[PDB]
Amino acid sequence: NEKLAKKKIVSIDAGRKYFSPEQLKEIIDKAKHYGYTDLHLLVGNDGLRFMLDDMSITANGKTYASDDVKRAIEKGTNDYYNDPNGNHLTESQMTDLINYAKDKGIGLIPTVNSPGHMDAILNAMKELGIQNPNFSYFGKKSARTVDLDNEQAVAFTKALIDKYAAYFAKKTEIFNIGLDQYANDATDAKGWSVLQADKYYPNEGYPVKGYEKFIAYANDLARIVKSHGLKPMAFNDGIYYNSDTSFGSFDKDIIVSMWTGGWGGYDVASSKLLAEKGHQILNTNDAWYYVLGRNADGQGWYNLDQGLNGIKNTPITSVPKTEGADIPIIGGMVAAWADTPSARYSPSRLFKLMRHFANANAEYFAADYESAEQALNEVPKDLNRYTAESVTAVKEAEKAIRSLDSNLSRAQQDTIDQAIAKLQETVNNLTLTP
Numbered sequence: 477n478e479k480l481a482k483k484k485i486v487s488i489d490a491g492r493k494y495f496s497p498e499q500l501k502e503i504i505d506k507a508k509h510y511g512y513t514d515l516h517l518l519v520g521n522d523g524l525r526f527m528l529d530d531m532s533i534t535a536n537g538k539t540y541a542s543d544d545v546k547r548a549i550e551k552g553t554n555d556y557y558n559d560p561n562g563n564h565l566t567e568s569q570m571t572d573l574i575n576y577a578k579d580k581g582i583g584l585i586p587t588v589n590s591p592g593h594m595d596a597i598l599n600a601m602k603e604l605g606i607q608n609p610n611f612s613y614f615g616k617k618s619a620r621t622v623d624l625d626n627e628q629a630v631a632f633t634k635a636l637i638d639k640y641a642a643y644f645a646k647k648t649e650i651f652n653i654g655l656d657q658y659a660n661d662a663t664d665a666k667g668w669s670v671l672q673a674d675k676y677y678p679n680e681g682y683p684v685k686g687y688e689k690f691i692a693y694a695n696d697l698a699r700i701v702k703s704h705g706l707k708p709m710a711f712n713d714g715i716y717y718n719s720d721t722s723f724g725s726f727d728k729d730i731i732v733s734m735w736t737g738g739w740g741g742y743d744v745a746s747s748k749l750l751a752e753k754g755h756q757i758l759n760t761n762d763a764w765y766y767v768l769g770r771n772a773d774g775q776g777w778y779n780l781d782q783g784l785n786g787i788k789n790t791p792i793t794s795v796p797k798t799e800g801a802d803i804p805i806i807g808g809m810v811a812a813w814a815d816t817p818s819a820r821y822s823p824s825r826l827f828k829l830m831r832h833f834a835n836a837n838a839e840y841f842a843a844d845y846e847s848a849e850q851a852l853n854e855v856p857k858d859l860n861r862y863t864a865e866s867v868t869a870v871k872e873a874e875k876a877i878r879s880l881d882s883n884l885s886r887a888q889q890d891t892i893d894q895a896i897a898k899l900q901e902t903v904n905n906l907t908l909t910p
């Protein structure tokens with residue numbers, strides 16, 4: 477029961493790339509069928525593809541009008557990638573989506589990313605007239621990352637997160653603030669190093685109090701998310717980067733989506749350290765990643781064959797960078813991304829990824845009872861015209877379905893399937909009294 481109690485989550489990048497309500501419902505249907513508990517839907521990730529009915533934002537001593545914010549965001553998103561399939565989900569569509577998923581026992585966890593991966597929000601702030609929102613590193617300007625020194629850009633971004641969190645209140649449980657990959661473009665994937673650099677290498681032009689400002693920013697977003705009764709979540713790479721606790725402390729109520737163990741010259745906190753500091757961990761191991769369009773071996777990083785290998789070889793309990801410690805988890809999340817958002821979305825390939833993750837960790841995933849429910853609905857209601865012996869067999873086969881444990885795992889699907897087959901056989905064997 478400890479395994480079944482974990483969250484099993486599929487993540488979809490509907491920030492970079494448009495997904496229709498119809499497509500998202502299909503993903504939810506497959507998630508339910510395969511025994512998942514949640515859909516993790518990025519809506520702000522480079523692109524911003526979710527618009528509230530009221531997008532008025534109060535910051536900087538004024539209100540930015542809802543119509544202008546909407547227009548700024550649509551335009552800013554299109555400047556990132558003008559997706560021929562669509563620009564954004566509406567509030568009505570999101571409310572209906574969350575309700576659709578709720579009726580299937582599927583939760584929804586949104587991401588609206590900052591202070592990185594916010595190309596569209598930066599664009600929108602400029603369309604509104606906010607000056608110089610982008611972070612720059614020695615003359616290289618980031619297209620994705622806000623400058624934490626810019627009070628007006630920061631205040632707007634926070635108010636925008638607040639506006640979305642207010643919407644998601646009471647209809648969801650977790651809100652992912654992201655926080656990954658600060659200034660990845662401008663610093664060539666060294667942004668955390670850069671933010672910490674001035675403390676250790678002063679008078680060299682590194683951002684003064686860079687990392688300390690990032691901690692404060694992260695903590696203020698956590699405060700804002702918690703005020704709405706939501707649990708804040710964030711990706712791990714910037715949290716105690718280089719295992720450095722000397723800049724300040726992150727809010728313990730931030731759940732960590734642990735997606736990377738780091739790489740050469742990019743030294744992240746271990747999951748051991750983060751657990752010790754008091755953070756819950758959602759295992760989001762990039763072993764399982766799939767980037768749309770990279771569909772076979774040789775087609776680049778996080779290609780589908782690599783992700784299926786990752787799922788085969790790295791179980792849901794294997795967290796990045798454990799330092800050999802036993803790391804508890806709240807669950808696991810398999811993620812599909814749209815780094816090249818003009819790539820064709822292939823449902824069957826995403827479903828294969830999701831199915832493989834479910835099958836490789838089958839004791840964790842819920843079983844599927846829907847066919848069992850259907851079979852019970854197909855039993856003839858009135859059995860009086862059949863022989864007592866044939867009737868008893870049917871009643872016994874029905875009782876046996878109703879007596880199945882109601883929280884079986886996917887590993888035990890055969891038990892359900894056998895019970896269905898027995899019922900069908902007994903119904904087929906109903907014999908009319910002569």
Ligand SMILES: CC(=O)N[C@H]1[C@H](O[C@H]2[C@@H](O)[C@H](O)[C@@H](CO)O[C@@H]2O)O[C@H](CO)[C@@H](O)[C@@H]1O
Binds near residue numbers: 657665711778
């Ligand atoms: C949390 C997360 O998964 N973030 C991104 C991550 O990014 C890639 C890649 O885009 C970066 O260039 C490198 C160096 O920082 O890191 C990762 O390899 O993985 C996903 C798949 O590429 C992205 O879609 C995520 O946005």
Ligand SMILES: [Mn+2]
Binds near residue numbers: 541543544
């Ligand atoms: Mn107007």
Ligand SMILES: [Mn+2]
Binds near residue numbers: 556
């Ligand atoms: Mn641009």
Ligand SMILES: [Mn+2]
Binds near residue numbers: 580846
């Ligand atoms: Mn159901």
Ligand SMILES: [Mn+2]
Binds near residue numbers: 683
């Ligand atoms: Mn500065």
Ligand SMILES: [Mn+2]
Binds near residue numbers: 718743
């Ligand atoms: Mn180090």
Ligand SMILES: [Mn+2]
Binds near residue numbers: 772773781
């Ligand atoms: Mn292959």
Ligand SMILES: [Mn+2]
Binds near residue numbers: 846849
């Ligand atoms: Mn049902």
Ligand SMILES: [Mn+2]
Binds near residue numbers: 846850
């Ligand atoms: Mn049904």
Ligand SMILES: [Mn+2]
Binds near residue numbers: 881882883
């Ligand atoms: Mn039980």
